[PDB]
Design a protein around this ligand. Structure first.
Ligand SMILES: *[C@@H]1O[C@H](CO)[C@@H](O[C@@H]2O[C@H](CO)[C@@H](O)[C@H](O)[C@H]2NC(C)=O)[C@H](O)[C@H]1NC(C)=O
Ligand SMILES: *[C@@H]1O[C@H](CO)[C@@H](O[C@@H]2O[C@H](CO)[C@@H](O)[C@H](O)[C@H]2NC(C)=O)[C@H](O)[C@H]1NC(C)=O
Ligand SMILES: *[C@@H]1O[C@H](CO)[C@@H](O[C@@H]2O[C@H](CO)[C@@H](O)[C@H](O)[C@H]2NC(C)=O)[C@H](O)[C@H]1NC(C)=O
Ligand SMILES: *[C@@H]1O[C@H](CO)[C@@H](O[C@@H]2O[C@H](CO)[C@@H](O)[C@H](O)[C@H]2NC(C)=O)[C@H](O)[C@H]1NC(C)=O
Ligand SMILES: *[C@@H]1O[C@H](CO)[C@@H](O[C@@H]2O[C@H](CO)[C@@H](O)[C@H](O)[C@H]2NC(C)=O)[C@H](O)[C@H]1NC(C)=O
Ligand SMILES: *[C@@H]1O[C@H](CO)[C@@H](O[C@@H]2O[C@H](CO)[C@@H](O)[C@H](O)[C@H]2NC(C)=O)[C@H](O)[C@H]1NC(C)=O
Ligand SMILES: *[C@@H]1O[C@H](CO)[C@@H](O[C@@H]2O[C@H](CO)[C@@H](O)[C@H](O)[C@H]2NC(C)=O)[C@H](O)[C@H]1NC(C)=O
Ligand SMILES: *[C@@H]1O[C@H](CO)[C@@H](O)[C@H](O)[C@H]1NC(C)=O
Ligand SMILES: *[C@@H]1O[C@H](CO)[C@@H](O)[C@H](O)[C@H]1NC(C)=O
Ligand SMILES: *[C@@H]1O[C@H](CO)[C@@H](O)[C@H](O)[C@H]1NC(C)=O
Ligand SMILES: *[C@@H]1O[C@H](CO)[C@@H](O)[C@H](O)[C@H]1NC(C)=O
Ligand SMILES: *[C@@H]1O[C@H](CO)[C@@H](O)[C@H](O)[C@H]1NC(C)=O
Lengths: 89, 433, 185, 49
């Protein structure tokens, strides 16, 4: 969170960075959000209900063996246009 | 005294529902790029864990407040393509599709008067990495560990919520807050709204054009008022001012010596040996920890006020937008008819439509009418007389009718009530036979 | 957290009073004791402040609980979405550890049907308005029914009230009114 | 010292009480309209059913 991707999570071999995690955690499915760009979750077009909030209208969930974490955009609700007429009740 | 006209008036109400979500970094604020201070800070227990845990409940409850205030409908309704709501003109508040986002005109006016600062809602490091002059308030604060998180719900989602609510309350009345939306003509809905506040339906059905014209004039006036004048949305600005000023005070409080040799860790460590540098470092650490605790305390106090305001906004919205309220002065001044919600950057705005009588006139009354030795009381109304003949009217409008057995009921004798007068009542059975 | 914060050196040699009191002369032992006591007192002050903060939220929830009791249970609230979703009927309280549980009973309509409606009926050149209810039609004939349920009835003089002429209402229609006195005579 | 002296508060309460006696509830939603007290009590009795 709070940083552009711009190759900086790798920070060259990750040995000069404060975290000591594997370089695999820095190279994976890359997605850019408004709250910082996320690593390790695939982006899907379809919209579901929010499960694990991320920020700026983006949610993540663990759904299908079950696949990896999927990041999508939350859906406010269904669609229903009321059949309004001026002589109908 | 009984009125003759009435006036349709539209008012405004502003209520904050959320404040900015903030976060702090303990080590960067206290030590500031020094390994010795970082190693020594581990001996003070779990102060940083306490602060980081306390500064997250506020962030989550801001989103909780927004969700509980705005998300009150399971579906998203839309208006029909053909728009004619019985002569009323809602184009000033309906969403405009031929524009970025779906904000209406009133919302567009609102997001310019009070949006003085949108804050650093997660700005990238490359935005200000020392290039050009730069070094504004946001970038200087970020280098000390103070950051600002982005809200969960973007402005487009809030606009969609408000549009769905407004379309549902126009095209279905209040029936969409109980079960499923049920369509009904707008005129036959205003008939119910008038019938609720002690006024019959023939008052509306014979004065429809006047109602429409008054409503349109009021909505034009309320549109002009926000654009002009001082733009009284001040309660939405005080929160931003308080947050920014508290952050500025926290930043400025970093230069205090706290009764030490210097206010910078590196100079103290360079100019003194550890045996005597320990006391100075301890003094600085405890001073900065006490400085940091008070900010958390004040934020935790202000969160309660924001939560109370959000709860009041949710209650008002549920009880006034989704239905008519009989509580006095809860939603506007006068007799409540119906209200519309609008969005604000950190709050909500209501446009209450009320009913105000006018043009009263003088009369004389009588509790009963002793005819044929019996006291006749009005079934629903009041006895009045202009000086020769007696009539039965309503209480909120002048509409005289002849005294009849249909709209009067007999009870007891006419020798016990103090102010009885003498008159005759006409039975409709006699004239036809 | 308050218990665990008792094992912090706070810059002293050790977090044990007995160890510091021994092994050292009074002039420096008292300095270490003051250093420990300052932290061990400010932590307790912080805990007291946090508890005093939480008490206000608990009271603000208790007031709402009492109001809901007095309004939903001891009566029947008419304010929307206060005592449950839908039209309120009754409530039953239940007791839970450090709280209270309400069982709101409501009323929701289920099955709808389309209709055509009119604002008034001009029979003898006079507009007739419903006393309480609506005018609906199933295609050929006209009825009058209440709003929240479907129960059609014939239009009569004791069910509608006249007002003015029928050249002002925008969408008036034509029909007939029973006038039940006439057939009996 | 407080902004509003006790005399002003007493004046406010007196105005409210005189209004609610001489005009019922109509003075809180527009202009005050006179009405005899007995008829106002009858209206309130109708209000409580
Ligand atoms: C009640 O008020 C309405 C409007 O406030 C009055 O209608 C106005 O009548 C005057 C008479 O010349 C016209 O000039 C105005 O144009 C009318 N108003 C509008 C909006 O067009 C009506 O007369 C009032 N009723 C009584 C009994 O005084
Ligand atoms: C509803 O009100 C709007 C005003 O906001 C009307 O739009 C104006 O219409 C007139 C004539 O059609 C134009 O001269 C103005 O320029 C319009 N104003 C704007 C801001 O576009 C609209 O016509 C009204 N609705 C109806 C049905 O007349
Ligand atoms: C009080 O109102 C009544 C009801 O309109 C008036 O009675 C009628 O007044 C009109 C006005 O010119 C006369 O043409 C009618 O002949 C009156 N009706 C009857 C049965 O006589 C009454 O005049 C009004 N009183 C005053 C003092 O104006
Ligand atoms: C209408 O008001 C007048 C003015 O107060 C009433 O006259 C008073 O009646 C009471 C009743 O016994 C007397 O005690 C007062 O002395 C009367 N006033 C004066 C100045 O003498 C009148 O009774 C009222 N009308 C009704 C029907 O009660
Ligand atoms: C209304 O009419 C009745 C009867 O027509 C009046 O009652 C009479 O009042 C006088 C008072 O001088 C008595 O002497 C009579 O005995 C009463 N009639 C009966 C049948 O007992 C009554 O006063 C009238 N009310 C008003 C306000 O004029
Ligand atoms: C509309 O409703 C009316 C009354 O419910 C119907 O009229 C009756 O229809 C039944 C058919 O089941 C006949 O047996 C009766 O003789 C009819 N009554 C009269 C007075 O004609 C009418 O058929 C309904 N129309 C539609 C299209 O459903
Ligand atoms: C409702 O019924 C009335 C009375 O039968 C209709 O009024 C007459 O309609 C005819 C039809 O063209 C006209 O020639 C007459 O001039 C009307 N009478 C008057 C006094 O104007 C009325 O048209 C009917 N409503 C509808 C919608 O047809
Ligand atoms: C930041 O990320 C965006 C992706 O939205 C990219 O276009 C841009 O080049 C990155 N770097 C900077 C400095 O903005
Ligand atoms: C998914 O969305 C992207 C942009 O958000 C778009 O380019 C792409 O065509 C979409 N694909 C489908 C299958 O909707
Ligand atoms: C009512 O609706 C019909 C069809 O949509 C339309 O022709 C008619 O003009 C509408 N009524 C008014 C008063 O415009
Ligand atoms: C009613 O009468 C009183 C006293 O005669 C007078 O002061 C008052 O103005 C009158 N009401 C109106 C609306 O004129
Ligand atoms: C009424 O008819 C419209 C179309 O004419 C339809 O969309 C709507 O579902 C109908 N009402 C109900 C309750 O089914």
């Amino acid at each position: 969170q709070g940083v552009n991707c711009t190759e900086v999570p790798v920070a060259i071999h990750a040995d000069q960075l404060t975290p000591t995690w594997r370089v695999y955690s820095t190279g994976s499915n890359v997605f850019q959000t408004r709250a910082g760009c996320l690593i390790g979750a695939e982006y899907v077009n379809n919209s579901y209900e929010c499960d694990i909030p991320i920020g700026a209208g983006i949610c993540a969930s663990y759904q299908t063996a079950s696949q990896s974490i999927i990041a999508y955009t939350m859906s406010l609700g269904a669609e229903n246009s009321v059949a309004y007429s001026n002589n109908s009740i | 005294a009984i009125p003759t006209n009435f006036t349709i008036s539209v008012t405004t109400e502003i209520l904050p529902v959320s404040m900015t979500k903030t976060s702090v970094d303990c080590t960067m604020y206290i030590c500031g790029d020094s390994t010795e201070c970082s190693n020594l800070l581990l001996q003070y227990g779990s102060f940083c864990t306490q602060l980081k845990r306390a500064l997250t409940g506020i962030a989550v409850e801001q989103d909780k407040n927004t969700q509980e205030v705005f998300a009150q409908v399971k579906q998203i309704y839309k208006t029909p393509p053909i728009k004619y709501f019985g002569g009323f003109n809602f184009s000033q508040i309906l969403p405009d599709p031929s524009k970025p986002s779906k904000r209406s005109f009133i919302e567009d006016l609102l997001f310019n008067k009070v949006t003085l600062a949108d804050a650093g809602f997660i700005k990238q490091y490359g935005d200000c990495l020392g290039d050009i002059a730069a070094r504004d308030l946001i970038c200087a604060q970020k280098f000390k560990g103070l950051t600002v998180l982005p809200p969960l719900l973007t402005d487009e989602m809030i606009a969609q919520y408000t549009s769905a609510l407004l379309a549902g309350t126009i095209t279905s009345g209040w029936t969409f807050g109980a079960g499923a939306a049920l369509q009904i003509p707008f005129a036959m809905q205003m008939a119910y709204r008038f019938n609720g506040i002690g006024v019959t339906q023939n008052v509306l059905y014979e004065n429809q054009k006047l109602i429409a014209n008054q409503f349109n004039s009021a909505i034009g006036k309320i549109q002009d008022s926000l654009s002009s004048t001082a733009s009284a949305l001040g309660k939405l600005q005080d929160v931003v001012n308080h947050n920014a000023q508290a952050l500025n005070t926290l930043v400025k409080q970093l230069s205090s010596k706290f009764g030490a040799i210097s206010s910078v860790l590196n100079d103290i460590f360079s100019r003194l040996d550890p045996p005597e540098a320990e006391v100075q470092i301890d003094r600085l650490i405890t001073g900065r920890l006490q400085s940091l605790q008070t900010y958390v305390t004040q934020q935790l106090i202000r969160a309660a006020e924001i939560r109370a305001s959000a709860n009041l906004a949710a209650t008002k919205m549920s009880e006034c937008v989704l239905g008519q309220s009989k509580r006095v002065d809860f939603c506007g001044k006068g007799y409540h008819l119906m209200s519309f919600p609008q969005s604000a950057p950190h709050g909500v705005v209501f446009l209450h439509v009320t009913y105000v009588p006018a043009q009263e006139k003088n009369f004389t009354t009588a509790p009963a009418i002793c005819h044929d030795g019996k006291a006749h009381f009005p079934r629903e109304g009041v006895f009045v007389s202009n000086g020769t003949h007696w009539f039965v009217t309503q209480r909120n409008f002048y509409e005289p009718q002849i005294i009849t057995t249909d709209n009067t009921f007999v009870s007891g004798n006419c020798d016990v009530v103090i102010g009885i007068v003498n008159n005759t009542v006409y039975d409709p059975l006699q004239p036809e036979l």
